Amino acid sequence: FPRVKNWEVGSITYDTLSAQAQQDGPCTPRRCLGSLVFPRAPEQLLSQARDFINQYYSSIKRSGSQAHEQRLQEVEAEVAATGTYQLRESELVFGAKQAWRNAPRCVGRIQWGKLQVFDARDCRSAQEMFTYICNHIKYATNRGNLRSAITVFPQRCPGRGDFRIWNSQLVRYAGYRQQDGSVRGDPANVEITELCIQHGWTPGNGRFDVLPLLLQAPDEPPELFLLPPELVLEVPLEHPTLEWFAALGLRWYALPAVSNMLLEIGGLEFPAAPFSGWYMSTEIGTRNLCDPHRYNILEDVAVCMDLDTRTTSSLWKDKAAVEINVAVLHSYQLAKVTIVDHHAATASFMKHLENEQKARGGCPADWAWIVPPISGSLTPVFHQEMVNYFLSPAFRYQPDPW
């Protein structure tokens, strides 16, 4: 049982939940790979299914009860008859919440109990997929009062291709390869922008052209779908005191809706299960706008602030980054779109760590992803030791469909 220390306050906990870690991570006693982004039978399915049902009934205090045994026997027969089994709707809800709760890289898990689950397990085609997704975006956006939600499309099974959302998020800006090597738009989306074009999408030419969706029903080519503009809430970015900031033409979208991860529950796998919450401001103002391989606007902003950019020791990069994050917070609040700054969010995650210590003896957390990308040690999570391990149900990465 690892000892976990907070170096700001001096408090000590012991992580007893890590003993129950399901799969194996990438580290060995010889070397730690904690900083890597991607860590490298019917009896197989039954064992995972049993552990999840036992989890679920323990969590509702029907532990070992009559309804517990009846569900266990039902799963056994279903797998024998068909090779898989079907979650009850309450189990699907519980499993989606647990998979969020178990995500080590998520700083927002104080919210894990409040999740809207849309059951799309009866979906039949890409057109129907598009309707579920539009319903999700509408519900989750809620005119800017964002609400967390997940839509669960049909599980994979043998003999049949998966449902897939080819886009990494529901809302993505195009990235256009230019004749001089550079990228106009978001460099992260250069591949999917080309995939949309190849599948017959008329490309824009702006830095913030919202991409169409490439949705894939089983064993069929993907279909392009245009998102109605009135459905995609965007926030033009302005600064509260730097009047020229508005004229940079920057904007970002309200709804972070991740669509390329796989949801795993009781040994079942959902390759299309988009989930959304709301943004932490550093995601937009630091990573998306200031990363050298994303919009990379830092030097542009520093020139407008008339900063000395020829020496690093004036900290022109730091001052411009902070004002971009100010602009993001100011612009979302003014537009009445839900957002949380990195101080508020890390303070809430500390409470989540405390709540989870009492709830189940620990909490899997990836320090490198929990600590914000600016002002790290100004937030309390910087001084918090953390233990990283993989519990199930879980969100996992998966290969691209193509």
Ligand X SMILES: N=C(Nc1ccc(CCNCc2cccc(NC(=N)c3ccco3)c2)cc1)c1ccco1
Ligand Y SMILES: C[C@H](O)[C@H](O)[C@H]1CNc2nc(N)[nH]c(=O)c2N1
Contact positions toward a copy of itself, by CB under 8 A? 2-5, 7-9, 15, 18-19, 21, 24-37, 40, 281, 286-287, 290-293, 298, 312-315, 317-319, 321-322, 325-326, 329, 333, 341, 343-344, 347, 367-368, 371-378, 382-383, 385-389
Backbone φ/ψ region at 265: left (φ over 0), alpha (ψ -120 to 50), beta: beta
Residue number, 103 or 301, with CB nearest to ligand HEM: 103
Tell me the residue number closest to ligand Y, measured at CB. Answer: 369
CB-CB contact of 208 with 173 (8 Å) = yes
Tokens standing for 277?
Answer: 């919450």
Separation of alpha carbons 95 and 89, rounded Å: 10
Tell me, yes or no, if 278 is annotated catalytic.
yes
Catalytic residue (one of 71, 91, 100, 109): 109
Site for ligand Y in 20-59 (CB under 6 A): 35, 37
The one-letter amino acid code at 338 reads: T
Tokens standing for 334?
Answer: 């003014």
| Using rule CB under 6 A, residue 195 touches ligand HEM | no
Beta strands in 309-368 (DSSP E): 339-340
Q: Identify which range of 50-58, 77-85, 104-112, 118-126 contacts ligand HEM by CB under 6 A.
A: 104-112
The one-letter amino acid code at 242 reads: L
Separation of alpha carbons 150 and 152, rounded Å: 6
Torsion 16-22-26-27 (CA) sign: positive
Catalytic residue (one of 264, 283, 323, 356): 283
Tell me how crowded residue 24 is: count the other CB atoms within 10 A of its CB: 11
Enclosing H/E stretch for 135: helix 126-141
Note the residue count of the chain.
402
The one-letter amino acid code at 211 reads: L
Site for ligand HEM in 379-398 (CB under 6 A): 395
Tell me, yes or no, if 385 is annotated catalytic.
no
| Using rule CB under 6 A, residue 139 touches ligand Y | no
Flag whether 244 is marked binding. no
Tell me, yes or no, if 43 is annotated catalytic.
no
Rounded to the nearest whole angstrom, what is the least distance from the CB of residue 287 to ligand X in the complex? 9
| Using rule CB under 6 A, residue 385 touches ligand Y | yes
Tell me, yes or no, if 106 is annotated catalytic.
yes
Tokens standing for 104?
Answer: 């080590």
Q: Note the residues at the interface with ligand HEM (CB under 6 A).
A: 100, 103, 105-108, 111, 115, 148, 150, 275, 277-278, 280, 283, 340, 345, 369, 395
Give the residue ranges of the annotated binding site: 27, 32, 35, 106, 169, 278-279, 283, 287-288, 368-369, 382, 397
| Residues identified as active-site | 106, 109, 278, 283
